[PDB]
Amino acid sequence: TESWKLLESSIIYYEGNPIGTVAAQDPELAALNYDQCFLRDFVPSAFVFLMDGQTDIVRNFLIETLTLQSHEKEMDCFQPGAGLMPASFKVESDGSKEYLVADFGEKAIARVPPVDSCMWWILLLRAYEKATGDLTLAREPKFQAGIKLILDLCLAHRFSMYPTMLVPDGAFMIDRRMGVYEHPLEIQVLFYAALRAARELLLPDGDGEQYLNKVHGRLGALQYHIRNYYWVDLKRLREIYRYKGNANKFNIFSQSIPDWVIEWLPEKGGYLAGNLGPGRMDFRFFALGNLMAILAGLASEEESQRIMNLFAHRWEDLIGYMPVKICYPALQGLEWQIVTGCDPKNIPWSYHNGGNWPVLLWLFTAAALKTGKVELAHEAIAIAEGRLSNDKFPEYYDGNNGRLIGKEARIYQTWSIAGLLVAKQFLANPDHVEFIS
């Protein structure tokens, strides 16, 4: 079919071998960095290849990125943690020899750190092991060392009383300044998910035993903290609205609860908030964080049900014309200005700021399946299928309900293409959902 053929065209070969897929195949626009392979972008590609049985590419991807981990990465005589995985890479030729060049954030726009990338790497490594049955790769000293360098960076002692992870703005899939600084849901959910993965991956050698305990320790803390403090429902909103200023551990002034939240939430709906920090709660709903919370089992069974109840009751908002809304609602007017620095790629209901992202369909489908809401997966896929092909698989969609093709969206965006495929594969064989859960 059309989609498989596009996916194969996106494949990047290195020394005769396939090692990844390009971000997009848009002929008209500037190559920019979309000719590169992004670690976060490759995940849904990997899943298609894993399910198809052609696993070489995923193995090689993991081997090459592990080697990139060891590359030299710096800006102005300062090195980040050694475990840092890159945002993306591409294949360059100096005459006859081929070599890999990575962007670890020293080339990236706004110099954002690709914090979710080392998380996805660990998750994908686990996904690869479960899908193939190849235990050989994770056992090697190289990979054990690489997992450990990541954990060193994650579990490093920081100035905080909480087990969450502190990041600058634009740390995850949202790579632009969007007020997702401090402790955004996505990073915490993926952090948790990566810690869970690390348990089966870490060999319990003398050194490893030290790591597994730290992992198990943080997993517990992290789950308590996210479920008790990030969780939002009407019951919880009533509690927060009545809190005293200066029980409230984060000093939330109830006048700082938005109007829209109260009217938006159905009685049986709920979700994990976007962010938590001193004097601050981000009541914006972030899709990927919430769906992965379901998949990774971070959310409880009821909480998972309440999230899908929320998608059901607020379908136009969160799915509309193109699944899935990245976050809701959009920053608008002056708020857009202060929070994003007048970032013109993120105008209201566009891109990170309220846009609709096809790739997220694969997470929505998995999470719908895990919670038994099959009808919702059918409808979301039906919606996506009706437009994507005709629209040439746009990177994103814009507007309250995703009616517009994204303002600066690239066409033939690989994870949009891969997102649809993976969602159809899950629908055909729901047991494959185990790989991401």
Ligand X SMILES: OC[C@H]1O[C@H](O)[C@H](O)[C@@H](O)[C@@H]1O
Min. distance of Cβ 176 from a second copy in angstroms?
A: 6
List the single partner that 23 binds among a second copy, ligand X, none, CB under 5 to 8 Å by kind. ligand X
**Minimum CB distance to a second copy smaller for 33 or for 300:** 33
Min. distance of Cβ 62 from a second copy in angstroms?
A: 20
List the single partner that 40 binds among ligand X, a second copy, none, CB under 5 to 8 Å by kind. ligand X
**Minimum CB distance to ligand X smaller for 40 or for 373:** 40
Give the tokens for residue 188: 């915490």
Q: How far apart are the first and last CA of the chain?
A: 28
**Minimum CB distance to a second copy smaller for 44 or for 83:** 83
**Minimum CB distance to ligand X smaller for 115 or for 137:** 115
Min. distance of Cβ 333 from ligand X in angstroms?
A: 23
List the single partner that 41 binds among a second copy, ligand X, none, CB under 5 to 8 Å by kind. ligand X
351 is in an annotated binding site: yes
* Residue 201 and residue 147 in contact, taking contact as beta carbons nearer than 8 Å: yes
**Minimum CB distance to ligand X smaller for 380 or for 417:** 417
List the single partner that 365 binds among ligand X, a second copy, none, CB under 5 to 8 Å by kind. none
**Minimum CB distance to a second copy smaller for 130 or for 148:** 148
List the single partner that 152 binds among a second copy, ligand X, none, CB under 5 to 8 Å by kind. a second copy
The residue with its CB nearest to ligand X is: 23
What residues are paired with 398 via a beta bridge? Answer: 404
What is the sign of the dihedral through the CA atoms of 353, 346, 343 and 331? negative
Q: Which residues contact 138 (CB under 8 A, 6 or more apart)?
A: 125, 126, 129, 144, 147, 201
List the single partner that 334 binds among a second copy, ligand X, none, CB under 5 to 8 Å by kind. a second copy
List the single partner that 259 binds among ligand X, a second copy, none, CB under 5 to 8 Å by kind. a second copy
Min. distance of Cβ 197 from a second copy in angstroms?
A: 18
Min. distance of Cβ 23 from ligand X in angstroms?
A: 4
175 is in an annotated binding site: yes
Min. distance of Cβ 396 from ligand X in angstroms?
A: 8
176 is in an annotated binding site: yes
List the single partner that 104 binds among ligand X, a second copy, none, CB under 5 to 8 Å by kind. a second copy
257 is in an annotated binding site: no
Alpha carbon distance 422, 419 (integer Å): 5
What residues are paired with 78 via a beta bridge? Answer: 75
**Minimum CB distance to ligand X smaller for 40 or for 306:** 40
* Residue 78 and residue 37 in contact, taking contact as beta carbons nearer than 8 Å: no
Q: Map the chain to HEC letters.
A: CHHHHHHHHHEEEECCEEEEECCECCCCCCCCCCCCEEHHHHHHHHHHHHHHCCCHHHHHHHHHHHHHHCCCCCECCECCCCCCCCCEEEEEEECCEEEEEEECCCCCHHHCCCHHHHHHHHHHHHHHHHHHCCCHHHHCHHHHHHHHHHHHHHCCCCCCCCCCCCECCCCCCCCCCCCCCECEHHHHHHHHHHHHHHHHHCCCCHHHHHHHHHHHHHHHHHHHHHHHHHEECHHHHHHHHCCCCCCCCCCCCHHHCCHHHHHHCCCCCCEEEEEEECCEEEEEEEHHHHHHHHHCCCCCHHHHHHHHHHHHHCHHHHCCCCCCECEECCCCHHHHHHHHCCCHHHCCCECCECCECHHHHHHHHHHHHHCCCHHHHHHHHHHHHHHHHHHCCCCCEECCCCCEECCCCCCCEHHHHHHHHHHHHHHHCHHHHHHHC
Min. distance of Cβ 343 from a second copy in angstroms?
A: 6
List the single partner that 173 binds among ligand X, a second copy, none, CB under 5 to 8 Å by kind. ligand X
Min. distance of Cβ 304 from a second copy in angstroms?
A: 22
**Minimum CB distance to a second copy smaller for 18 or for 113:** 113
Which chain residues interact with ligand X by CB under 6 A?
Answer: 23, 38, 40-41, 173, 175
**Minimum CB distance to a second copy smaller for 96 or for 228:** 228
Min. distance of Cβ 107 from ligand X in angstroms?
A: 13
Which residues are annotated as part of the binding site?
33, 109, 175-176, 351
Which residues are annotated as part of the binding site for beta-D-fructose?
33, 109, 175-176, 351
